[PDB]
Amino acid sequence: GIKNELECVTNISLANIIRQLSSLSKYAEDIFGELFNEAHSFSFRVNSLQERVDRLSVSVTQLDPKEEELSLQDITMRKAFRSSTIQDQQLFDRKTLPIPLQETYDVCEQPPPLNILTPYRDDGKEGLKFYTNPSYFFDLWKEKMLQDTEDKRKEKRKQKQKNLDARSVLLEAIRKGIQLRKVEEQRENDVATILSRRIAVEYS
Amino acid sequence: AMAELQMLLEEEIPGGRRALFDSYTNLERVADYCENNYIQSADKQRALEETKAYTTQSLASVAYLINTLANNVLQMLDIQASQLRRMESSINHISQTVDIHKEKVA
Amino acid sequence: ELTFNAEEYSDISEMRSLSELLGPYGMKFLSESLMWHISSQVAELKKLVVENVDVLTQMRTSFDKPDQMAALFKRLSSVDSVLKRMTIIGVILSFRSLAQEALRDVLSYHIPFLVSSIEDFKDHDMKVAMNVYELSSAAGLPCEIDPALVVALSSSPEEEYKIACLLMVFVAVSLPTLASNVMSQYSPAIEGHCNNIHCLAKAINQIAAALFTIHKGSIEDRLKEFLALASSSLLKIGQETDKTTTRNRESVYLLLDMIVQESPFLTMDLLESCFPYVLLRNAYHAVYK
Amino acid sequence: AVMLYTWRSCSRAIPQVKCNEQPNRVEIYEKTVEVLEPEVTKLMNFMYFQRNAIERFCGEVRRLCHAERRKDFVSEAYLITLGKFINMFAVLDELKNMKCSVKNDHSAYKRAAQFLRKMADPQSIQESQNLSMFLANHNKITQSLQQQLEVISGYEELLADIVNLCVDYYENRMYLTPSEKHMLLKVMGFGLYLMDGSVSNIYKLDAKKRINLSKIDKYFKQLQVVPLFGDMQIELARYIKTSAHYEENKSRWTCTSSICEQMIQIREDHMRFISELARYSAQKTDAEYRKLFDLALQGLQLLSQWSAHVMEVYSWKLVHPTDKYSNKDCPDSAEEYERATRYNYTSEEKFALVEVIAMIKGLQVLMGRMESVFNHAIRHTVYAALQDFSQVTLREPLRQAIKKKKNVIQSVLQAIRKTVCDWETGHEPFNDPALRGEKDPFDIKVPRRAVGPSSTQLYMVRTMLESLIAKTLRSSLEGPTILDIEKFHRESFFYTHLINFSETLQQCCDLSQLWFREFFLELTMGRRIQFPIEMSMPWILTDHILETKEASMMEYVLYSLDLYNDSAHYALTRFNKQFLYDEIEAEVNLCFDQFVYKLADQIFAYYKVMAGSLLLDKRLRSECKNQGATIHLPPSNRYETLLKQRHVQLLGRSIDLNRLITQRVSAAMYKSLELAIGRFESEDLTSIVELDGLLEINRMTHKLLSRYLTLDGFDAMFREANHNVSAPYGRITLHVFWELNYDFLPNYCYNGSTN
Numbered sequence A: 001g002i003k004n005e006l007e008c009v010t011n012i013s014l015a016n017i018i019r020q021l022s023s024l025s026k027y028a029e030d031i032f033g034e035l036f037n038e039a040h041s042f043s044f045r046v047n048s049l050q051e052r053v054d055r056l057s058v059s060v061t062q063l064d065p066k067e068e069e070l071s072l073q074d075i076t077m078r079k080a081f082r083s084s085t086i087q088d089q090q091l092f093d094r095k096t097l098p099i100p101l102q103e104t105y106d107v108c109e110q111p112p113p114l115n116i117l118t119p120y121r122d123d124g125k126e127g128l129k130f131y132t133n134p135s136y137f138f139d140l141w142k143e144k145m146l147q148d149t150e151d152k153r154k155e156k157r158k159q160k161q162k163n164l165d166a167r168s169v170l171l172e173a174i175r176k177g178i179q180l181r182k183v184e185e186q187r188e189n190d191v192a193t194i195l196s197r198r199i200a201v202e203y204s
Numbered sequence B: 001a002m003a004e005l006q007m008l009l010e011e012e013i014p015g016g017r018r019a020l021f022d023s024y025t026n027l028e029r030v031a032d033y034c035e036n037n038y039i040q041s042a043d044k045q046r047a048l049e050e051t052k053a054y055t056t057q058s059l060a061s062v063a064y065l066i067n068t069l070a071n072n073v074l075q076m077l078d079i080q081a082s083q084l085r086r087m088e089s090s091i092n093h094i095s096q097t098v099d100i101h102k103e104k105v106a
Numbered sequence C: 001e002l003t004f005n006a007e008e009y010s011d012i013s014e015m016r017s018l019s020e021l022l023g024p025y026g027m028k029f030l031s032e033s034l035m036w037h038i039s040s041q042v043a044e045l046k047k048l049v050v051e052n053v054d055v056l057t058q059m060r061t062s063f064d065k066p067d068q069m070a071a072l073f074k075r076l077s078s079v080d081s082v083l084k085r086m087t088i089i090g091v092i093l094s095f096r097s098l099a100q101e102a103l104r105d106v107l108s109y110h111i112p113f114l115v116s117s118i119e120d121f122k123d124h125d126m127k128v129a130m131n132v133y134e135l136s137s138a139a140g141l142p143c144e145i146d147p148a149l150v151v152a153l154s155s156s157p158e159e160e161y162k163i164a165c166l167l168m169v170f171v172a173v174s175l176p177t178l179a180s181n182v183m184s185q186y187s188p189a190i191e192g193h194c195n196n197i198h199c200l201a202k203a204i205n206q207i208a209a210a211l212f213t214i215h216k217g218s219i220e221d222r223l224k225e226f227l228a229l230a231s232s233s234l235l236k237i238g239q240e241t242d243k244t245t246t247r248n249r250e251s252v253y254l255l256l257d258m259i260v261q262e263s264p265f266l267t268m269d270l271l272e273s274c275f276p277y278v279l280l281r282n283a284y285h286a287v288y289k
Numbered sequence D: 001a002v003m004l005y006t007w008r009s010c011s012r013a014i015p016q017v018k019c020n021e022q023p024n025r026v027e028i029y030e031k032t033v034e035v036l037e038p039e040v041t042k043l044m045n046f047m048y049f050q051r052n053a054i055e056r057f058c059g060e061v062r063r064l065c066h067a068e069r070r071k072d073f074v075s076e077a078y079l080i081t082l083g084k085f086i087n088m089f090a091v092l093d094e095l096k097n098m099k100c101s102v103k104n105d106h107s108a109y110k111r112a113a114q115f116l117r118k119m120a121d122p123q124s125i126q127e128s129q130n131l132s133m134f135l136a137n138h139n140k141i142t143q144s145l146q147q148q149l150e151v152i153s154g155y156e157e158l159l160a161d162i163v164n165l166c167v168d169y170y171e172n173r174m175y176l177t178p179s180e181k182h183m184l185l186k187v188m189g190f191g192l193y194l195m196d197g198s199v200s201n202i203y204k205l206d207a208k209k210r211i212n213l214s215k216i217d218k219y220f221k222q223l224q225v226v227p228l229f230g231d232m233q234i235e236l237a238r239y240i241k242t243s244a245h246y247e248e249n250k251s252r253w254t255c256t257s258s259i260c261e262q263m264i265q266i267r268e269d270h271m272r273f274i275s276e277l278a279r280y281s282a283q284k285t286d287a288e289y290r291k292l293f294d295l296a297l298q299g300l301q302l303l304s305q306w307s308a309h310v311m312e313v314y315s316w317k318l319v320h321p322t323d324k325y326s327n328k329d330c331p332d333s334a335e336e337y338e339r340a341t342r343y344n345y346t347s348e349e350k351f352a353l354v355e356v357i358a359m360i361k362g363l364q365v366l367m368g369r370m371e372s373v374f375n376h377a378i379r380h381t382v383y384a385a386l387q388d389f390s391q392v393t394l395r396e397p398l399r400q401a402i403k404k405k406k407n408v409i410q411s412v413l414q415a416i417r418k419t420v421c422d423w424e425t426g427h428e429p430f431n432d433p434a435l436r437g438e439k440d441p442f443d444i445k446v447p448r449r450a451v452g453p454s455s456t457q458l459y460m461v462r463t464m465l466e467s468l469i470a471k472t473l474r475s476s477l478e479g480p481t482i483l484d485i486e487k488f489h490r491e492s493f494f495y496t497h498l499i500n501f502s503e504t505l506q507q508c509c510d511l512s513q514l515w516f517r518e519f520f521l522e523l524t525m526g527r528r529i530q531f532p533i534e535m536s537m538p539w540i541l542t543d544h545i546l547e548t549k550e551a552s553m554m555e556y557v558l559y560s561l562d563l564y565n566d567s568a569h570y571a572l573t574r575f576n577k578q579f580l581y582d583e584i585e586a587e588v589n590l591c592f593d594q595f596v597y598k599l600a601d602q603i604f605a606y607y608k609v610m611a612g613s614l615l616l617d618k619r620l621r622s623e624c625k626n627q628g629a630t631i632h633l634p635p636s637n638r639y640e641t642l643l644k645q646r647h648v649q650l651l652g653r654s655i656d657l658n659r660l661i662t663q664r665v666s667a668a669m670y671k672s673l674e675l676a677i678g679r680f681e682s683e684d685l686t687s688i689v690e691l692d693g694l695l696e697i698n699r700m701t702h703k704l705l706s707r708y709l710t711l712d713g714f715d716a717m718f719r720e721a722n723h724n725v726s727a728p729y730g731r732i733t734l735h736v737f738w739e740l741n742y743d744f745l746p747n748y749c750y751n752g753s754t755n
């Protein structure tokens, strides 16, 4: 209402200002903690790199050009160097949600406990998924991509039809080197993979 | 220096964060007191003067603890940057040394 | 009535071919001749600054008062000459970059063990640092301060510094006049303007870097001052409605982005504080659609 | 309203009982009651709420419609509140109307409770009976309201006052946020509907010029559809079309019959305002603080205009889904929602929408950055206006109130002064001639504080001033003074909004409703548990730019992604539902992975084509042009700003877009190099020249990409692809010897003269 005492409002609203400074202290701690944790994680990598950089210096100074022999077995018996090919995907899985937001989420209304009726179903499906199903977006997109892929594959065929030796030891190392790239070649619910397959059909 | 970074990582930043979580719990009790004390006292004028005093003190404290912890974080990032700068220089010299060696064999 | 195609003499393959033939000696000579022509343009600009010395000094301290700013502007003479001559400098410097970039790529392929040592030595005093830079620019390495430009522009110490400072002011307050020029239109096919004003980004930066090295001032500060005044002057025409003066307003705004992208002394954060990116974003949209 | 809008069917999740011969029959009903009982309590409380709200609203309408009380003053702010009451009844009725889930969940519970014989009071039995009846009946809240109003004599006069105020406010722009704007139209509409009935007739009230139907008709034609709740829209003219006396009076209405120019203006205003705003971004003068006050209000109004534009377009599209006749690419088999969203926008419409969204969000950032300056200048200006008006401006009318015998006017003028005046001395000046009755030979220095009045102070002052200008108290006041009160009353209208700047900013830029689709989901009747991404507005808008690679729009694409932030914040703070956040997050998780793929793919392709063009012989280019076979130069694009993004803020995450793009671009570089070397291996020795050219294009590509991205050194990339890192001779060297041995030596003929 409007009938409250002036000084009483002043004191209450000043008490709430001190509460704001309390929450701001917690908010500040969370911010500084998230930044610290990343920089701290970098420290482990920096230290672990610095030691690798230092013991390489030693290994490199001890290299002898006069001594070093070249082996053709580096080609046939040992694998080719591969640099890291790791890619980050699925960046919004629940486990990436920061604590502050996770706390706000936990006080929001949970859905009705419909999974208690799961064991009484004929279809072995989960009861809650008939109420809310986050995996729906991907399931349908994957399905659409697969169907669109087949539709284009059988449209290229629709248009195509209604139209028309013991002399050098290095040779063996290369010959076997080719076999370890043809036979040793090819020895998924990933968004990139699925998108690649859909595009790859529009070329082959 | 490695020692400056050790101080920041293991002691000063955890210390500054602890002081910040303490500020969170303490000011919640301070706010409670200021609100209750005013309601509970007949001497309202003195109670408000006390709230005013706790407000100013609280504002000054929070600003200080944030300023201190921020300055430490910036110092930590400045040190880590210069670490990578020196390391790149060191890696580059190794790379040049390997290049030289591979050419000598050739 | 041109008898030649400029692209067949100035593109990447051609400049690389030139560098193969001329080498470091030849390309260094080519640049020295380019720098001579910039010296002549600079000497002419200083004349125009001295001719406007009174108005320019007042404009430098009256930057916060708009009524007398627009009033002082009308008292300036030969503004078109200032822009024209800085564009020419920028054009010559744009050609040098092409030359240097080609030389760099030719050397890195011909003398990689020497280039490696030069790159390391550059990446890790103010008179001693020029000797590192002359050896670096000889191998086509881009330098923050151009040694050949410093030499060419070295040809009363307190008086010279003022003229340099006032040149920056002269240029900054003149930039909005470019918006009335139909040729100031930015083109996506060019990634620049039909009248070469994009080359001003290179002129403004490199001339400031050179002059304030010779006069031992602060390059960062003088360019920061320049940007503040440039942004201010250009923001003023944003409220203007005249179809003549604002025809290429948005294309001229894009210069500020180019100046900051080109300058190692200027940051996007600093740009944001005096010229909000949303204006540049909308400007890019206007010219690309 | 939130409870209803977010009520998804529980019974659809319940395993049904097929016959009386089911083994788990009892357990199902048992568990049904355990789940549904807490939900039925909410429905009970809702039944009870609407009942008490209608009774209370009508009790207040009765009170204000008393014979002589009808001839008395009623506060504008309160009439508006009564307007929001009738809209609340419309909202709740329509949400209840569309929600079969609610009815069906109660019946499922009711069926379960009975087949278990749970012990219930005679109170509980009738309670349960009332709810069944309530949920079974369509338009029940509207009907109850209509019966309880029409029993009140003269009720239409009060409603007419409410309507006339809305018309007045809408005409004279007495609103700030888009929701306020739309509320006026919704009150007009349902107001007229309620006035047109068995007892009252709106066409007769128009004949007496009590209301102005023509003006309402004009507004409804200009703006035909506005949001009612969530994705549930209201077609304003529906209130007209279904009113008691519509059929006989069809001729009176033009609103019952049924973007390029828009964008020119928006882009101009954006240019004009933001240019000024940027310039303004020891104490200042009254004029300087006032100017910042003016800008704050101007910028909020502009943001509101833009947001209203976007939401009104969207709102219109939702009630007018397209078909094959209007869109050749839209099949008759396409479901309503996809016809309402996806197919209902041309390429040009989608670009224009992202523009405005970007212009809103961009200006929102600049306004937010200026908050502290604005807060201070607004407080100074509001204080100064209120004190100058109370201490100084009210002297003359106060003098004339005491000089004559006008006690009533004196008492209110004094009460105002008592409530707000902050005298510099601490006390009111008693030596004041005007306070006595005689004129001045007198000067008061009014203080300058950076603090506004309290909401109660402002309410009291405004309401008391209003009563003076509403024998009435108005006729007993002078000419210039009446204009002075009106002046201050009009200007003080926005003070609360401006004092609460931060909250007002958000309300002027609210685009959170583009994602929500509970109404359309309910209409699918269990067929859909959600809609796929190609029907989702944020993704429609975002993917369109990725797919077209539209250069002019590439710097806008993150702004359409940011719509997910608006919706997720709304779902967590306003809807307060976990399941809605769960769904937005899962949509973002999917769409963002696609965003990174499509963006990285086109960026690499763009810089490869650039490299290929840069190194293509110029003479050959011109020769091909003359031969009528121009090798078409690639269009330039604007990818750099995206490449510079190190911290995209999305759903509380900090996303390093640069790092993610690099991961893919680096893989693309390696794949290019592998292909170049593999191509050589499948061909004879003469093809080595071609290889060298291709390697050089790859080198140029790496160089162009290295301006923005950090990649492995080109030599390192090349040595790896060439298998020359852990081996002494690479693939190129080994294929050369292979070809020498198998092709060159045995098959070639040297010509010594030509070499």
Ligand SMILES: [Cl-]
Binding pocket: C083, C084, C087, C195
């Ligand atoms: Cl020019």
Ligand SMILES: [Cl-]
Binding pocket: D228, D229, D230
């Ligand atoms: Cl709503």
Ligand SMILES: [Cl-]
Binding pocket: D077, D458, D459, D462, D463
């Ligand atoms: Cl009011």
Ligand SMILES: [Cl-]
Binding pocket: D565, D568, D569, D650, D651, D652
């Ligand atoms: Cl968020």
Ligand SMILES: [Cl-]
Binding pocket: D679, D690, D691, D694
């Ligand atoms: Cl090829």
